[PDB]
């Protein structure tokens, strides 16, 4: 368990001075959590959950050049909408189909 | 009860939502709607909407149909669209083929004033602006054409005709009381069958007036007054589409 | 077609005839007619007219009825009247007696704005001013209350009701296309069985709109639109009929 100076708490597995394997990271400030598989101290695959229940399940960029999400499915709790898609580049989010009512990604 | 929505009642009930037109253009409309209704062979020509532009010369768009049949399980209207810059003199909007209909949906932006404008795509594809305007009107009409349920009915020879004994919609705040115009009268398809968060309904129950606003197309408003049984719909603003509905909601 | 007349339609179509209502009064009517309609319990309530008074303030008069019956060979409407100075608060307009109405008949000239003034007549009689107002209003109403012919019909339990499937008055530029409200729909008593020069009709065939002006009571105007079956009547002016009508003709 690593408690960071900012208040962010990482709980999980370490390997050679970095985060690795299964781990879950809680942000201080924006109460959002990254849960799943870590490699070289960065997120690779899993679920990013907001403070209300909305989330994004899929594959994120690794430690390489940032931990930004790359592809997967968004689910917004306010409207219960779910959309599958990917971040093309410059942050522009392109979806594959129109949103449809669904449920939270409970693996 | 009603057989064709007014222009005055629509412009009055939808004024609060910003759906207003200039007063001089209002008088020009009052004079020059029957002229176009008689020049063309149409029997029901109303005002469809008003699209904005980079100039001040917005596009006023009107829609009219002669026959309205029931083909292949859908109520199809042989619509004809006209456009103008001022309410005086109207021109026609010719339909567009499928290749252009797919090459016109990628041109996001605000339309300019001169309808002789050519956009360029990629070799270079030169597309006229009137084609883009017709594409946007067709898309909005496909997504948004709203009428009260059971307001139409089927007769012999399978023509959709106004229900002259329509007693209004109970619960005018529920989306189940409204339907697309191209849904057959017998089918139980309504706006509820669309995406859940697309449509917003605000119902003044004392004065008995309901407003349905499109959130997928933010500039489309529809009003339905139950006590007098008058329903109308207008579209103000440009015809671009709200892709990221999931984030806004 | 229409269920009740629309105030904005009346003001829009009868504006050329000098029958107008101020902007503040327009908005106040728009917001206050429904409130009084709901409080009273009346299915229908609409602006009946605007009698002009001496000082600045005027008398806006509205009337409302619940259901119209068929009794003694006539269409009996049980109406209730309300008056106001501003378009915000609608007080009641009380009914008057017979001899008091005869005494109203001898009061001439423009009445004064204050509803507390008392007129003097002859043994001296004190006549309240609201009594004079009601006398004039009921005289005008029982003289000229126009409705297009066969736009109402009887039904089970014998109550005259709107005719939902109504073809529209044919030959609408003639007095036979209109009738008095209190005339039964079945009978052929129309607007042509009264004096030969008490009514005037103007017609626009392209717009399809007809205006009927009462000459016995110069301030009574009626319109009927053919394309959309909407009709409405309004009174503007003091409640005096020109007894010297023949010399005018």
Coordinates of N, CA and C in Angstrom, one line a residue, chain A residues 3 7-9 12 24-25 33 38 42 46 49 51 55-56 79 82 89-91 95 97:
Chain A
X3 N 0.8 5.3 0.0 CA 0.0 6.5 0.2 C 0.9 7.7 -0.3
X7 N -2.5 12.4 -1.4 CA -3.6 11.7 -0.8 C -4.0 10.5 -1.6
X8 N -3.6 10.4 -2.9 CA -3.9 9.3 -3.7 C -3.4 8.0 -3.0
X9 N -4.2 7.0 -3.0 CA -3.8 5.7 -2.3 C -3.8 4.6 -3.4
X12 N -2.2 -2.7 -3.9 CA -2.1 -3.8 -4.8 C -0.7 -4.3 -4.9
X24 N -5.5 -1.3 -7.4 CA -6.5 -0.3 -7.5 C -6.1 1.0 -6.9
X25 N -6.4 2.1 -7.5 CA -5.8 3.4 -7.3 C -7.0 4.4 -7.0
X33 N -11.7 6.1 -9.4 CA -10.8 5.0 -9.1 C -10.4 4.3 -10.4
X38 N -2.1 -3.3 -13.9 CA -1.1 -2.3 -14.0 C 0.2 -2.9 -14.5
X42 N 1.8 1.9 -14.4 CA 0.7 2.5 -15.2 C -0.4 1.6 -15.4
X46 N -8.9 -2.3 -17.5 CA -9.8 -2.4 -16.4 C -10.9 -1.4 -16.4
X49 N -13.9 4.3 -12.6 CA -15.2 4.6 -12.0 C -15.2 6.0 -11.4
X51 N -17.3 9.2 -9.1 CA -17.8 9.2 -7.7 C -19.3 8.9 -7.6
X55 N -18.9 5.1 -15.3 CA -17.6 4.4 -15.4 C -17.3 4.2 -16.9
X56 N -16.1 3.7 -17.1 CA -15.5 3.4 -18.4 C -14.7 2.1 -18.3
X79 N -28.1 9.0 -17.0 CA -29.0 8.6 -18.1 C -29.1 7.1 -18.3
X82 N -25.1 3.7 -22.5 CA -23.9 3.0 -22.7 C -23.5 3.2 -24.1
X89 N -7.9 10.5 -31.7 CA -6.7 11.2 -31.4 C -7.0 12.6 -31.0
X90 N -6.2 13.3 -30.4 CA -6.4 14.7 -29.8 C -7.6 14.7 -28.9
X91 N -7.9 13.6 -28.3 CA -9.0 13.5 -27.4 C -10.4 13.2 -28.0
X95 N -17.6 7.1 -31.5 CA -18.3 5.9 -31.1 C -18.7 5.1 -32.3
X97 N -21.6 3.0 -32.5 CA -23.0 3.0 -32.6 C -23.6 4.1 -31.7

